[PDB]
Each structure stands twice: as C-alpha cells, then as structure tokens.
Amino acid sequence: ERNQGSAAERLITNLYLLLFDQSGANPAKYYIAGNTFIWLPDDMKVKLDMTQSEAGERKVYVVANVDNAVKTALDAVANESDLQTVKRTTAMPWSTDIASPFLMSGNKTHDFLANRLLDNVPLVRAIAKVELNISLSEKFQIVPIIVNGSLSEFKFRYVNFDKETYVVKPTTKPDNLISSANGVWPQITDWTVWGASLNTSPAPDAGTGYTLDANGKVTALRIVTYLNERDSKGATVEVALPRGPELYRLPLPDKILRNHWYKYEVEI
C-alpha cells in the first residue's frame, strides 16, 4: 500500500535545490533556509528568481531537511554523481537518534522553456521503517516484572543496521554496520529492555510498547524503529523472551529500501 504516514514523517524544515544542465554539471544551487519559513508549503511549491530562458532544460534535484554538514557538502557538488557521495552518519542508526525531520531527496528532468512550472518532484525519504507486532502464545503470557514502565525480562537488539544516510543512494550502497548490543546468551547484559513509549495515547511514531490483559499478563509486544537503507543482506531484529531466555531472530529483507515501511505480524 501507499501510506502518507504522519505529519512528522512528512515535515519539511528546509530545502536545497540543484539544477543541473544538459551535461549533468554546472548546477544552479538554491538553499531555502528554515529560518525563512521561497518555499510555499501551502502550495507545495518553490519559487525561484531564475527565469525560463536562464533555466532551459534542467535535471532538478531537491533535498529536504539537510543539516549544516550535508548542506556544505551540497555546496561543493559539481556533478550529478557527487550527490551519491553525500551522506550523514548516525552512531546509533535506529530510533530515536533517527527521527523527524527526515532527510529526503528527489529529482525530475524538465524543460523550463516549455513550462515555467515543474510539476513535480517526488521527495523520497532516505530512511526506512520497521514495525513488529508480536502476539505472544500462552507460554509467554506471564505477569511481567515492570520497572519504570519497562519489561525487565523482555529484551531486544538491532543487528547489522547501517550507519549511513545517503542523499542519493549509490548504485550499490556499501556497508558501514553496527548492532545495538553484542551480549551473548544467557546474560545478554547489554540488550535493551522492552519500553512503553508506544503505550501512550497520542502515541509517537516510533518506540516500543506492549499490551497487558485483565490478569496483568503480557499478551502482545510492539516495536517500531526507523533505519537506514541497505543493498546488502543481514539486518536483523532479535528478541529475548522469558523461559536463560528464549531468543528469536527476525531477519529483515535482503534489501532495506528507502521510504519503505515493513510491517510484520509476528506469532511467537
């Protein structure tokens, strides 16, 4: 399905446009700064002072929600291919260190001599989203030890998530991998205990949560995280359930694609 997501997932706080000419070089650059928020969000339109005759035919790239590092890299871009070398690194590349506003990019080729308006440039988020809804079978439906809202006995880790967010994905994205925990069974000392941030009633877009029945037994678990795209296999979510604990692995897809939302109904 195509799903527009939340307002936070769609938030645009700045824009950077690059208008390449025929040879994919000499790009005209326009940074539309967040402190000026010309950008017409209510028209979903950027107006530039470059005229039709100045523009001619252009390969138009739009990047949204840059930070200063990414902006400065874009300021130095000379060729279309350079865009595929501009990337942001995140030490812990999952929620919530990856959060709104999300880096986005898109492009379209357009002849401005023919029409002053380019309609339109589709802006594609550079990250992906993973949602696990775990239904627990009877052997796991226990009264949980809860500490500050978290489930001490239920734990998870992200394995082989990529640290890089590319503005434009390289032809074959290389690897820069990390896991959120590396503790081995049975202690799994550094794994993350299950949280309750999703149990709130506006409910954020990412986090962890769970459901208790009337007997106070846990019957379902939920985890939602953002993550970076991967062209290579190995990204995994692992969960530890009370029995040492029982460990379950969910391999994510062989490719994690940008602006895809992978929802799993998991029965354990």
Partner: peptide, 28 residues
C-alpha cells in the same frame, strides 16, 4: 489584452512521496 513575456521566473512543485508499506505474517 497582452500577456507577460513568456520568460517567467520558474517554479518547482514538490510532493512528499508516500511510504511503500508492506505487510508480512511470520510464525516461530
């Protein structure tokens, strides 16, 4: 009635592309 010279300041429409959302059932 004369219209403006057809050499206008340019405009770029931008739309935020929907997620592609996929669902899968898995059991253990």
């Amino acid at each position: 009635a004369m219209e403006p010279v057809e050499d206008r300041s340019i405009e770029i429409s931008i739309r935020v592309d929907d997620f592609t959302k996929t669902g899968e059932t898995v059991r253990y």
